[PDB]
């Protein structure tokens, strides 16, 4: 579940795991396909699409989806989630505004995007009716068994985590998640790369002049614009899109 910089995250620009990129109000059926940077779906391991894994800390939190809310000018209706990606039936709206409820906090994310829903037809409704003729609209699927396209999803770059840079009672003290690769030095001269377990820092003292980094590329990410490049390489991780636009007859 990637974490990026939401633009108007309740107050202002936070870093939400559900940071909204690639809003697509381009279909007709009241539907938008969205990508959160969060990867809900199965858990970390193997079970139940209808659970909920975002990033809290450096860490995931693969738990229940209980109180998702996509919304716009009005509250939307979820359609389905798969991967980083959710489909939801929305009305028109100047913006798009997404958010779940972890339980202790609202913890939402919101974004600008021009949305409309013309139905296909010479009638310019604002909303799909219960009746009328069927005719060839453009629309996204409910399903996941989907390969019609795939987007590049290679590694994450590093990320900041100054929870690492503690103090060794006079020196600034870095640690490691699980033996992950922490890329480290300070403005002063000390250890210059950092590919280590928990190091200390001989030279500098201040937490605010050091490289708290997490090269933790055991799991790839979506290639968000709000991602820092993993400078090393274009790793593999070509990964499908579920919600292909299909020729449904709305």
């Amino acid at each position: 579940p990637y974490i990026a910089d939401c633009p108007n995250c309740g107050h202002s620009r936070c870093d939400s795991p559900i940071a909204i990129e690639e809003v697509r109000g381009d279909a007709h059926a009241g539907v938008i396909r969205i990508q959160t940077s969060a990867m809900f779906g199965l858990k970390t391991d193997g079970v139940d699409l209808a659970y909920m894994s975002f990033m809290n800390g450096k860490t995931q939190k693969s738990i229940k989806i209980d109180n998702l809310h996509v919304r716009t000018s009005a509250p939307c209706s979820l359609v389905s989630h798969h991967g980083y990606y959710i489909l939801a039936q929305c009305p028109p709206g100047d913006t798009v505004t997404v958010g779940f409820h972890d339980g202790p906090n609202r913890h939402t994310c919101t974004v600008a995007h021009k949305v409309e829903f013309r139905p296909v037809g010479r009638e310019k409704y604002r909303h799909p009716p219960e009746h009328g003729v069927e005719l060839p609209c453009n629309r996204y699927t409910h399903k996941r068994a989907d390969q019609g396209h795939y987007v590049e999803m290679h590694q994450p770059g590093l990320v900041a985590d100054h929870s690492l840079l503690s103090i060794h009672s006079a020196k600034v003290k870095i640690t490691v998640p699980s033996g992950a690769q922490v890329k480290y030095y300070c403005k002063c001269p000390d250890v210059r790369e950092g590919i280590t377990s928990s190091d200390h820092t001989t030279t500098c003292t201040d937490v605010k002049q050091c490289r708290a980094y997490l090269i933790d590329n055991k799991k790839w990410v979506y290639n968000s614009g709000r991602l820092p490049r993993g400078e090393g390489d274009t790793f593999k991780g070509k990964l499908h899109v579920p919600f292909v636009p299909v020729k449904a007859k709305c």
Partner: antibody
Amino acid sequence: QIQLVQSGREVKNPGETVKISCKASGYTFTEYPMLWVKQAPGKGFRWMGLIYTNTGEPTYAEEFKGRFVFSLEISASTAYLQINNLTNEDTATYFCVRDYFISLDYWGQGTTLTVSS
Amino acid sequence: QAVVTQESALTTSPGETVTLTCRSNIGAVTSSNCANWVQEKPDHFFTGLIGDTNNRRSGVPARFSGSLIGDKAALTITGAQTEDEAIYFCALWYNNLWVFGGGTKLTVLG
């Protein structure tokens, strides 16, 4: 396993110098530096500084920069505290300590100095 | 140039759960303060309990755990024992030096 055994307690008249030893056992001296702490009779515990037993560089607490000098008989796994031009208000107990695990894990027995004519 | 503050004395009974705290005069205590807890038994006998907020020194009973509660570092003794009657000192790191708290005298029934 780890034992830091300190010298015995001295008496010294004002003006004198003292060298307090701390002989380390159980660890590799070199990967764990030494904390010197002063627990003054009433006042409680105070950090006097730390010595990098690898390079040999000492840090002094500002209260201790001056008459205090840390050094080490590397070779024998000893760290030493030297307090020169002893002032009468230096009577107290000094502990050596191992810095490890984001804090201090082992403390010595203490060497108590009684500055007195 | 920072003042660590601790409860002065706390009295408990064998079997109880007791919490000691460590407050910093400059602000909330955080993981970059690497809270340490040290115990002093009679005879100038020092042992380290916890370091880096929650790392228990090896051979320190599990009834001892450290954490941050609110804006302070805390030591919890779960199932205090008669043997735990001693002075507990907390230490906080401040980018270049250590500051020790005044210590908490803990008394345990037994």
